[PDB]
Amino acid sequence: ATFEIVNRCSYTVWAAASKGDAALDAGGRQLNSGESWTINVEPGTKGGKIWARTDCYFDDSGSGICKTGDCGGLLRCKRFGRPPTTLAEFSLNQYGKDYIDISNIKGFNVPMDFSPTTRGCRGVRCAADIVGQCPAKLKAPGGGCNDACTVFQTSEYCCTTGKCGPTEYSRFFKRLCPDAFSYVLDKPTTVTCPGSSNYRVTFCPTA
Structure with a gap:
């Protein structure tokens, strides 16, 4: 796909695409304003994620740091990102459908539209100034608006027991x-799309 x-x-952002234990495509890439990066994801992939990283530095080999979303100090993410993301x-391709969502369960750094580029289903968006409003205890120095489970590590916020x-x-x-999902057990705002759909992620959409 x-x-x-x-x-x-x-x-500028530094986009990331991972499943958790491996990159997707090249696993990440700088995007200056206006720049598009098309990737190939396999069919049947489960539990994939795409995010932005902000205020990065990477050296010639690719190792560095970002202030939001860092994936173990790699330009080319093979693991998921540090919140807020x-x-x-x-x-x-689950059993005949793909399923798409946007999640604020690790916080928020960048506004996002995640729309199908092929028919049958509707996209999802979170574009609101969450970071402008963000409650003080959830603010992240480094940028963004953390989730409560990152800031406080309680069973209630982290839904540790499944309750x-x-x-x-x-x-x-x-x-x-x-x-967007606001906590682990939120009523699902998932979207079911035909299997083998294509998609566009856009950061700052309303920009």
């Missing part, structure tokens, strides 16, 4: 992006 990752923000999430409810903090993310 095809992912076209478009930086419509006015600042707005997340595009997907598992493809939890919404919270004042989950609800701050759900007021601003009803169409």
Whole structure:
């Protein structure tokens, strides 16, 4: 399948695409404003993620640091990103369908649209100034708006036992992006698409 990752923000991002234990395609790439990076993801991939990283430095080989979303200090992510990271999430060709979501369960750094480029299903977006509003205890120095489970490490926020409810903090993310997951047991805002769909991720969409 095809992912076209478009930086419509006015600042550079360092896009990342991982499943957790391996890169997807090249695993990451600088995107200056306006730049598109199309990747190939296999069919049947489960639990894939695409995110932005901000305020990075990488040296000639590729090792470095970012202030949001860092994946073990690699330009080319083979693992997931340090919060706060707005997340595009997907598992493809499940049993005849792909399933797409955007998640604020690790926080928020960059606004995002995650739309299918082929018919049958509808996209999902979170574009609200979450970082401008973000509650003080959830602010991340380095940039972004952390989730409560990152800031406090409780069973209730982290839904550790498989039981939890919404919270004042989950609800701050759900007021601003009803169409993204705001905590682990949120009513799912997943989208079911035909198997083998293609997609566009766009950062700052409304930019």
